[PDB]
Amino acid sequence: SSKYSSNVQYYGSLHNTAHVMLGRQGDPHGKFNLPPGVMEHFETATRDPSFFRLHKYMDNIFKKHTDSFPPYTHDNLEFSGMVVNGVAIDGELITFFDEFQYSLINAVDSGENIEDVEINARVHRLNHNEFTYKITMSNNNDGERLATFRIFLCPIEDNNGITLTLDEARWFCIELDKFFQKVPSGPETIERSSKDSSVTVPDMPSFQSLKEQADNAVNGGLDLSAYERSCGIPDRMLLPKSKPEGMEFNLYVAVTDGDKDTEGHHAQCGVHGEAYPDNRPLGYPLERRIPDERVIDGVSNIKHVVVKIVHHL
Amino acid sequence: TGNAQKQQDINHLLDKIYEPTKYPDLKDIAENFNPLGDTSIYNDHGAAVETLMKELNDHRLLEQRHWYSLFNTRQRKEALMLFAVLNQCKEWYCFRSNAAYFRERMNEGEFVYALYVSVIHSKLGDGIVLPPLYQITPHMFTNSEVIDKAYSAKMTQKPGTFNVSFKNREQRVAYFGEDIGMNIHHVTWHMDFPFWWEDSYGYHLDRKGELFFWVHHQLTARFDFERLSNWLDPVDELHWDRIIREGFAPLTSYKYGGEFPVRPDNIHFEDVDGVAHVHDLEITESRIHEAIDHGYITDSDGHTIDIRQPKGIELLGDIIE
Ligand SMILES: [Cu+2]
Ligand SMILES: [Cu+2]
Numbered sequence: 025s026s027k028y029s030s031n032v033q034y035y036g037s038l039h040n041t042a043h044v045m046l047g048r049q050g051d052p053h054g055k056f057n058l059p060p061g062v063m064e065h066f067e068t069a070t071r072d073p074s075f076f077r078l079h080k081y082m083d084n085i086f087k088k089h090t091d092s093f094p095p096y097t098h099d100n101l102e103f104s105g106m107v108v109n110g111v112a113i114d115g116e117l118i119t120f121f122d123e124f125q126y127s128l129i130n131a132v133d134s135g136e137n138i139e140d141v142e143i144n145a146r147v148h149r150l151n152h153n154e155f156t157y158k159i160t161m162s163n164n165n166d167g168e169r170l171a172t173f174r175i176f177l178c179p180i181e182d183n184n185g186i187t188l189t190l191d192e193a194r195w196f197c198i199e200l201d202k203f204f205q206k207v208p209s210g211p212e213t214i215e216r217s218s219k220d221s222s223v224t225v226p227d228m229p230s231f232q233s234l235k236e237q238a239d240n241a242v243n244g245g246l247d248l249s250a251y252e253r254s255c256g257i258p259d260r261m262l263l264p265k266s267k268p269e270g271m272e273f274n275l276y277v278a279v280t281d282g283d284k285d286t287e288g289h290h291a292q293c294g295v296h297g298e299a300y301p302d303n304r305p306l307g308y309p310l311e312r313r314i315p316d317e318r319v320i321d322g323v324s325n326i327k328h329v330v331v332k333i334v335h336h337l
Numbered sequence: 338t339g340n341a342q343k344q345q346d347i348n349h350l351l352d353k354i355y356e357p358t359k360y361p362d363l364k365d366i367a368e369n370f371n372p373l374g375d376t377s378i379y380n381d382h383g384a385a386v387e388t389l390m391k392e393l394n395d396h397r398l399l400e401q402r403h404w405y406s407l408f409n410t411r412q413r414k415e416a417l418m419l420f421a422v423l424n425q426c427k428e429w430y431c432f433r434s435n436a437a438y439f440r441e442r443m444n445e446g447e448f449v450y451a452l453y454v455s456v457i458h459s460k461l462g463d464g465i466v467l468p469p470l471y472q473i474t475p476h477m478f479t480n481s482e483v484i485d486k487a488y489s490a491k492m493t494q495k496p497g498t499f500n501v502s503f504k505n506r507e508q509r510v511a512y513f514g515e516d517i518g519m520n521i522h523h524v525t526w527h528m529d530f531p532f533w534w535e536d537s538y539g540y541h542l543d544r545k546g547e548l549f550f551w552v553h554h555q556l557t558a559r560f561d562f563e564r565l566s567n568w569l570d571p572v573d574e575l576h577w578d579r580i581i582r583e584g585f586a587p588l589t590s591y592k593y594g595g596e597f598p599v600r601p602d603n604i605h606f607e608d609v610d611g612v613a614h615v616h617d618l619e620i621t622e623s624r625i626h627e628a629i630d631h632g633y634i635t636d637s638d639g640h641t642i643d644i645r646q647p648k649g650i651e652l653l654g655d656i657i658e
Contacts (some may be wrong), residue, residue: 184504 038085043069053261061231078100087195095313098323103281107166107324111277113331114215115155117262119265120153120336127231138150151260157216163207172217172302175201176310177263178274180330191275196308197225197276200262204282218262223291225256253293265286266333273333278309279325340431340464346433347465350452351473354445355402355592358437368439372422378431389439392418398443404594405446410421412447417533419443419451424459424538432461445593449474454528458538470524471517476592478517484590507583510563519556526552532658546651549658577619580605625657 025037047061062072083314086237128143163169178197181187189197205214228251229237237246264273284303291301305311305316309326320326352468373390376383392398398415399405419439425657426432430619436452443451449470456462477633479487479501486499503511513519530545534561542548573582584600591597608614628634633641634652644652 184506186504 033034040080042082046072046074046078053061079305090311091313093312093313095317096309098319101278101280101320101323101326103169103171103279103325105163106161106169106171106279106281107164108159108161108277108279108327109211110158110160111275111327111329113155113158113275114158115134115335116153117155117263117331118334118336119150119152119263122149122167122260123147124149124227149258151259152218152263154218156218157201157214159214159279160212160218161207161214161279163209165209168209169207170286171205171207172280172282172285172304173201173203173205173214174276174278174280174308175199176276176278177331178276178310180274183289189319191314193274197307197310199263199307204286204301218259221259221262223256224259224260224262225254226250228254241242253290253295255293255295263333266335268335268337270332270334272330273330275329276310276328277327280304280308311337341464343429343445343464344466346429347452347456348468350436350440351449351468354449357441358619363437363440366434367441370431370434370438372438378427378434379422380425380427381423383425385418385425385437389418389422393442399447400443401444402593403444404591405450407450413442413533416444416447416450416591419447420455420458421538423451426459426461429461432459445474452618454531457528460539469517470521471567474592476590478520481588481590481596502613505566507564507569508569508585509567511559513560513563523556544651546654549654577606577615577622628653 025032025035025040029035029037044060044064047064048058050056050061051058063069063078124147125144126147128145129140132143134140136148156171157175159173167233176197177200178190178193179188180193201216201223203216203220203222207214234248237248286301287303289299289301291298294300302308309320314320320328341609349358349363353359358367372386373383376386379386391399392415401411405416407413420441421502422435423432426435429561432455436448436455439451440448453467456465461527466469475482475487483499483501490496503515530542530548534542534545555570564570564572575581581600581604582602584602586599587597589597606615608616628644631641632645633643634656635641642652
């Protein structure tokens with residue numbers, strides 16, 4: 025229920041209200057005058073478990089609609105010349121637990137002529153290791169064509185170990201990268217780094233660091249143009265945590281037709297009115313019922329290869 | 338005697354149990370014998386025999402080709418009378434005879450049960466090794482599928498072995514409970530030391546009490562272990578005031594009887610007519626839990642028998658089971 029709402033007086037605001045609604049569960053009539061709760065704030069909701077319980081619900085509200093569309097045909101997905109030949113990781117894909125430090129100073133009150141003591145907080149966050157993509161594929165077209173490199177990382181077995189079906193698992197897939205590259209007319213091997221991913225953002229510069237820099241520029245003459253929008257998730261979060269034993273995920277490389285995608289136009293963080301560049305709906309082409317896998321499987325420009333992730337303890 | 342004799346006889350007795358015997362000797366015996374005409378073979382001057390007969394006569398004994406549970410207070414009594422004959426035989430001539438004579442007009446369950454317990458406890462059954470229940474009466478140890486696959490084999494007279502079956506449950510720790518070896522032991526353990534033993538039968542099973550305490554503590558432990566190995570959590574303790582969380586479908590069938598009733602999950606314990614009230618347990622449990630807590634068990638006279646000693650846990654197992 026943003027203001028783009030057609031009939032806000034009727035459809036109200038499920039999601040928002042659901043936030044506040046779940047928050048006072050500690051004090052509804054407010055006899056205690058407890059403050060708002062973890063869920064009644066963005067920098068703190070991911071905290072509380074019902075957070076994900078509440079969005080699974082919202083999630084399948086959308087899924088009901090997302091799923092009403094007729095599955096996709098063959099003539100539908102195909103990029104006529106362009107066929108991926110192979111998908112390989114010149115990698116590892118290994119995840120561990122790094123250590124980070126942010127500063128607790130704005131937290132403690134320091135009046136005056138009492139001086140600053142540098143206090144710090146050290147946290148334990150997840151991390152992985154750089155690994156590159158190696159997409160091998162031919163342009164059996166006459167010239168050069170623009171292409172969208174779409175890469176999802178879907179699950180394989182059930183945690184019962186049932187091994188679901190790219191119907192059961194299509195919706196479960198997390199986007200790992202999306203980029204537009206020009207393909208040359210024949211055999212080519214394109215590469216792509218953990219680090220070039222479009223759904224990722226690096227940890228940010230420290231406050232002090234940004235001070236030192238704002239200052240160091242004003243005492244004798246600032247380019248952090250890297251960080252002026254940043255919509256993404258932490259690079260450390262790219263891949264999932266996994267098992268120490270390791271597990272096999274299913275890597276989906278689907279290469280659609282750049283010219284019809286970007287058939288019109290940062291553009292990742294459209295923070296200022298900037299028209300989202302891709303035109304395909306979102307989660308393409310795994311956003312639709314996939315009744316017989318028989319199909320995904322016979323379009324040249326879609327290819328799936330199993331990867332394996334290991335967790336260093 | 339011998340054994341390769343006693344033994345032979347046994348094997349014959351328990352052969353194709355669900356149908357009148359095909360071993361000619363067993364049948365002229367089955368016909369011509371009279372358990373009441375030489376009250377001398379019997380160490381009771383055949384009071385046992387004369388009591389079965391009386392029932393067999395008023396024909397008030399459970400029918401053949403019918404089910405049987407050892408939990409049925411009558412079915413048990415009947416089963417247990419056969420035990421009592423077979424039991425006071427001075428020699429093989431009297432056992433064979435009876436477990437032939439009866440074999441042919443007593444129900445199979447009572448019969449199978451009777452013969453085993455009898456062989457196990459009676460003075461006269463030393464040499465013998467009993468065939469594995471699982472092959473004697475396979476409906477109690479085999480799946481319902483394999484069972485039907487076997488009935489088909491037979492209909493068509495075409496032989497062969499079928500593979501039995503067992504991601505959605507905790508029928509992941511199934512390999513443990515459904516094993517034909519454990520199932521054997523579990524029954525044998527309680528054949529060895531039956532809940533119904535009266536020391537009149539001849540001797541005294543020593544510490545059946547602690548034995549009882551312990552045997553289950555180990556199934557219970559052994560079981561807890563397997564669930565460990567399966568990312569499963571130690572087992573919930575059952576309460577009479579709560580729901581039966583984890584129900585199952587056995588997909589098992591009786592030979593004569595039908596298919597084992599299934600239980601849905603999240604059910605409420607119902608007062609079952611004929612056995613006892615739900616509450617009837619609750620109180621029992623209390624009476625039990627008060628002996629433990631007092632230090633003493635109180636008998637029928639209001640005599641407090643102390644259990645804060647070594648004999649303790651068995652006296653407790655005597656009242657608990
Ligand atoms: Cu939300
Ligand atoms: Cu038992």
